[PDB]
Symmetry: C2
């Protein structure tokens, strides 16, 4: 419970960023992962269009999410794109994911954004059930195409 802290990472928070990436690595079961150098990660963290939120128990990162800002041409109110969200396997199903989403939308609300969106694979039943429990405004069925470049 309230021991749980949500923190938006700042530029002097590289070690917490790396901690979160390691969390992503374990929860998503990424194989043979080679983390990019700290120079590259620091520059990413320093971008004005990128926001990381972590969940903390004392100094344990037990969950987190990453998000990108997409400036619009349809409107001056930006969009936020939640890219990854994960909670440590030993801490899932305890309200952390929800608190992360809540804090994230609250932050972009204060910033006057129009909308925050997030995606899940249609086959990921548990992810779909989670996002549906966060009372989103709406959900849409879509097809994601990608081009692996040479």
């Amino acid at each position: 419970d309230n021991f749980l802290k949500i923190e938006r990472l700042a530029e002097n928070d590289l070690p917490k960023f790396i901690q979160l990436i390691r969390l992503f690595e374990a929860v998503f079961e990424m194989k043979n992962f080679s983390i990019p150098d700290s120079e590259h990660l620091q520059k990413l963290l320093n971008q004005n269009n990128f926001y990381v939120f972590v969940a903390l128990l004392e100094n344990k990162i037990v969950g987190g999410l990453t998000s990108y800002v997409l400036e619009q041409y349809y409107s001056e109110k930006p969009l936020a794109y939640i890219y990854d969200l994960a909670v440590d396997t030993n801490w899932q199903r305890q309200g952390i994911g929800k608190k992360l989403i809540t804090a994230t939308n609250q932050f972009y609300t204060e910033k006057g954004f129009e909308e925050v969106f997030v995606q899940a694979d249609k086959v990921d039943d548990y992810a779909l059930d989670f996002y549906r429990s966060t009372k989103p405004t709406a959900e849409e069925q879509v097809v994601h195409f990608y081009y692996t470049l040479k």
Copy 2:
């Protein structure tokens, strides 16, 4: 079309950008739309994580797409997100969409990107048939959630 030119907009291409946005308004049939101030749109075009491609016959923009750069923490090579794509309704089905997609992926390959991705609504049959003809590496069923902020 051997008079068709494909062009990547630079910082001094605001008039073409505005022209593409009006094309988007018409083709997407947006109602009661107000285009943002030019100073807003000019700053967006100035961003180095935002790239616009347009299709031209003489001075006339007949199509185009917008794309966002998403820097990764999984790799040093960025992702590109194709956000909008449209061709003037009088000029559809003549290869313009393909050339746009081709030029876009060629650009991002030259920049050392890992991947380009794009999304179409499940009900958008014509959009889906188009993307499925552009030889995408893969396609995934995805559910898209959004939070409309106050």
